[PDB]
Design a protein around this ligand. Structure first.
Ligand SMILES: C[C@H](O)[C@@H](O)[C@@H](O)[C@H](O)C(=O)O
Ligand SMILES: C[C@H](O)[C@@H](O)[C@@H](O)[C@H](O)C(=O)O
Ligand SMILES: [Mg+2]
Ligand SMILES: [Mg+2]
Lengths: 434, 434
C-alpha cells in the first residue's frame, strides 16, 4: 500500500461562546484543530489521523503549514513508513529549508509533529493496537531508533536511553495488566476557566470532586484579588484533602510571580503552572527558588526536547507537562519522557485543548509501561469538552483514565463534526458569520 | 490616509545553482523573501515594505502567515500607526490566538515581525528619513514606548532603558556625523560558503581582503578534516592580520563542539558562530567555558528578546548576532540592543540572506548613534548576493557600510525582480520547473 494523499481541514469550535478554556492570557479561545489525514490505497481502516491544537485565529495558517508537507509524504510506501518511524520523522525534521522556519519550534514544527503523529497512528492501526501498547511493546532498540539524539549527548545518550528501557522490560507485562485493571490518575481543569462566574467555579469544583477527581486546577494571573477570592472559594468547596493547582498561563515576570504566589500559598497549592514565559528556563528556576516548596511546572508550550533538557538541567521545575501536538510528534515526546525519567522529574500531561485528552493519554500510558512504572504519583490532565467529536473519546471512571482499546492514536474525528465546524464554510460558521 | 491593503509575495532566488549561502546545516539554500507591502491611499511613496527571509521550501507557508495578518491592519489610519508603533506591534503580538502558534517564535512571529518592520518603513518614509535616523532621532520616551518590557523586569526595566538612552543623547548628533563620514565596519561571509571548492574559497578570500574587508567568515561543521584544510588555506590566503570567523550553523552537540574547535584554534579564530542549537542557552555557555578564550556567538535564529536575555544572563556568548527578520521587528530588536548594551556585549548583526544587509544595517547604525556609541569594536555582516533586486542596495566602501540616505528601511524590491522570481509562476520558475 502507498500513502496517496495528505488531507487537511481547518476545524474550529466556538468554545468562546461560554468561555470554555478561558484563562488570563487567552481570554476567549475557540478550541481548534488543524486536522490531518494520511490516506492510503488500502482498507478504509488503514489511514493515519492527527491534529495540531490551536485556539482560533491562525488555525488556517497552521493548516496550510501541514498541507505544505504533502510532497514529502505522498507516494511513500506504507510498509516503509511504519517500519522506520525514526527515518520518517527525520525526513521532515532534517529538511534544512523547513528547519529555517523554526528550527523545531512554532507553526512549522507543530505541522511536522502532526504528520509524524498521524504516521504513528497509521503504524498502531496496522499493528491492530491502541498507540500506548504499540509504543510500549516495541523493543528498546526499536524505540531508541525513533529518537533524535542530537543536542542531547550531554544529558541522554542512546546507550543511556537503552539502559532505562531495558531496565523496564521485565515488568512491562505486569504493568500493562495493572493499567488495564486500574486506569491512570487524572485531574480536571474544566471547573477553573477564568471567564466563569464564582458561582459556576464552585458548582463545577464540587461536581469535579463528586466525579472522583482528586485534583483540580484553576486559571489565575489577571488580578491577584480575583485569584485570592477564587482560590479561597474553590478550596472551601472541595475541602482540605483535594489537590488544587493553579495556572498563570505565562502572565508574570520573575519578581511579580514570586510575590503573587506568596499571596496564594495559604490555600495549599498543588503546583503553579507556567508562571512565566515558556522560553524562560532561568526565569522558572528563579521563581522556583523563590517560592519553594510550592511546586512549579511548565511544558505545554515547551517547543522541543532541547528546552526540556535545560529545564531539567537548570532545576527550573518540580514537574513538567508534555503535550502531544506542541513538539515533533511521538518521537520527540519519547525523548522528553526519557529525559524526565533519567532526571527523576514527574510528568503531568497537558490536555487542555480539543482532542488533546484523546492523544496524550497514550503517551502517559506508554511511559508507565515501558519507561517509569510510575503513575500514582502523577496525573493526566482532563477537560470536559468536545469529546463527542472523536470516534474514540476518552473514558474517565472515578477520576481515572481508562486505557484505550481500539487501534490507533484516538485522533480520528467524526466526518459530521468536520462538516459542521470546518472554518469558514462549515455549517456552524456560515450561520454564525451571517 | 489609511492602510488599504496588505500585499504579499512568495519570492525565491535560485542561489542553490552555485551553492551561494551553503553551509553544514543548509547545503543548498535558495534565498527567499516572504515579501510584504503595506499599501495606503496616499502618495505612491507612502507605503511600507518588509520581508521574512527563508531559504526555499516553506516560503509559501511563511507568506501565507503574513497574508493572514491583513484583517489586523487593513483599515487602520496611517497617522495612528506611525504615531504609536508600540501600540501597533502589540496589536499583533498581544493577539492571544496568534500567540498560541508561537508564542513569539517561528513562522507566526516572523510574519508579525515583517508587518511591524513594514510599519517602521512606512513611518520613516513619512518622516522623510532613512530608518536608522528615524530611530536614532526619536526621544528616549518615544523609544521605550515601542518596547515590550514583559519578561525583562529582572534584567532591563523601562527606567533602566531610559537611563541608557538619555546618557547617549548629548553625543547623538556628533556620532551621526561620524557615521556619515566614516561608514560602519563590515565583514564578509561570501568567500566561505561550504559548497565552494578550495580554489574558489581562496580566490574569494583574497578578493575580500583586496576589497577592504578586515574580517571574513567560513562555514564549518560537516567534516573536521575539511574544516582544518579550509581554515589553513584561508588563513594562508588572507595573512595573519585579517580576522577569520567560522560558522557551524548549529551542527554540534556540546562535547563535540569543544573538541572540534580545539582542532581549529591554531588558525586564529575570531569567533565560532552557532556551535550548537539556537535554543541551548546552557549548552552555548558550556561550550564557551570549554573553548575560552575562543569567542562564541549566536543570534541569527534566536527567537526573541527573552532568549537573548538568558544568553546574556548565563554568559553564553562573547558577542551576539541580531537579525532584522527573525524577531518581532524593530521593537524587539531595540530591546535586544538595549539588553546587549546594558550587559556590555558586542553586537555583530547577521545579514546572511536576501535583503538582510539592506535591513539590518539600519539597526546597527541606530544603535551606534542612540545606544552604544561603539562601532570600531564590531562589524555588520555582508554577503555579496542579490542586492540588484532592491531599490536602495547597500553600499560598501573599503570594507565599510556607507550610511543609507533615502527614506525607509531599504526593503523595497524592484517590481521586475518580483515578477521574475515569484514562486512558482514567476518567469524564472516557470522556465526552471519546465
Ligand atoms: C487556552 C487553553 O484552554 C489553556 O488555558 C489550557 O491549555 C490550560 O493551559 C491547561 O493547562 O489546561
Ligand atoms: C543559509 C544561510 O546562507 C546561512 O548559512 C547564513 O545566514 C549564515 O549563517 C551567515 O551567518 O551568513
Ligand atoms: Mg496550562
Ligand atoms: Mg551564521
Amino acid at each position: 500500500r502507498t500513502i496517496i494523499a495528505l488531507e487537511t481541514h481547518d476545524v474550529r469550535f466556538p468554545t468562546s461562546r461560554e468561555l470554555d478554556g478561558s484563562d488570563a492570557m487567552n481570554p476567549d479561545p475557540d478550541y481548534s484543530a488543524a486536522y490531518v489525514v494520511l490516506r492510503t490505497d488500502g482498507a478504509e481502516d488503514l489511514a493515519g489521523y492527527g491534529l495540531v491544537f490551536t485556539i482560533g485565529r491562525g488555525n488556517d495558517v497552521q493548516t496550510a503549514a501541514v498541507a505544505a508537507l504533502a510532497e514529502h509524504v505522498v507516494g511513500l510506501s506504507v510498509d516503509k513508513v511504519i517500519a522506520d518511524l525514526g527515518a520518517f520523522a527525520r525526513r521532515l525534521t532534517n529538511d534544512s529549508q523547513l528547519r529555517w522556519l523554526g528550527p523545531e519550534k512554532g507553526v512549522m514544527h507543530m505541522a511536522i509533529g502532526a504528520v509524524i503523529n498521524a504516521a504513528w497512528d497509521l503504524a498502531a492501526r496496522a499493528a491492530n493496537k491502541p498507540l500506548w501498547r504499540f509504543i510500549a511493546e516495541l523493543t528498546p532498540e526499536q524505540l531508541v531508533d525513533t529518537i533524535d539524539f542530537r543536542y542531547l549527548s550531554d544529558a541522554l545518550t542512546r546507550d543511556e536511553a537503552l539502559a532505562i528501557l531495558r531496565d523496564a522490560q521485565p515488568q512491562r507485562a505486569a504493568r500493562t495488566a495493572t493499567l488495564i485493571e486500574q486506569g491512570y490518575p487524572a485531574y480536571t481543569t474544566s471547573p477553573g476557566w477564568l471567564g466563569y462566574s464564582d458561582e459556576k467555579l464552585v458548582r463545577l469544583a464540587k461536581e469535579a470532586v463528586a466525579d472522583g477527581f482528586r485534583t483540580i486546577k484553576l486559571a489565575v494571573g489577571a488580578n491577584v484579588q480575583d485569584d485570592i477570592r477564587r482560590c479561597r472559594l474553590a478550596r472551601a468547596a472541595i475541602g482540605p484533602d483535594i489537590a488544587m493547582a493553579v495556572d498563570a498561563n505565562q502572565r508574570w515576570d520573575v519578581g511579580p510571580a514570586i510575590d503573587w504566589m506568596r499571596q496564594l500559598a495559604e490555600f495549599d497549592i498543588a503546583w503553579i503552572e507556567e508562571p512565566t514565559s515558556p522560553d524562560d528556563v532561568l526565569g522558572h528556576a528563579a521563581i522556583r527558588q523563590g517560592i519553594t516548596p510550592v511546586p512549579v511546572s511548565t511544558g505545554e508550550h515547551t517547543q522541543n526536547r532541547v528546552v526540556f533538557k535545560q529545564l531539567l538541567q537548570a532545576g527550573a521545575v518540580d514537574l513538567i507537562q508534555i503535550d502531544a501536538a506542541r513538539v515533533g510528534g511521538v518521537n520527540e515526546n519519547l525523548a522528553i519522557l526519557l529525559l524526565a525519567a533519567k532526571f527523576g522529574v514527574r510528568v503531568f500531561p497537558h490536555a487542555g485543548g480539543v482532542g488533546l485528552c484523546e492523544l496524550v493519554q497514550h503517551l502517559a500510558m506508554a511511559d508507565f509501561v515501558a519507561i517509569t512504572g510510575k503513575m500514582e504519583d502523577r496525573a493526566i490532565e482532563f477537560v470536559d469538552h468536545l469529546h463527542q467529536h472523536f470516534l474514540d473519546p476518552v473514558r474517565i471512571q472515578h477520576g481515572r483514565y481508562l486505557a484505550p482499546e481500539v487501534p490507533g492514536f484516538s485522533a480520528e474525528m467524526h466526518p459530521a463534526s468536520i462538516a459542521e465546524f470546518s472554518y469558514p464554510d462549515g455549517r456552524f460558521w456560515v450561520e454564525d458569520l451571517a
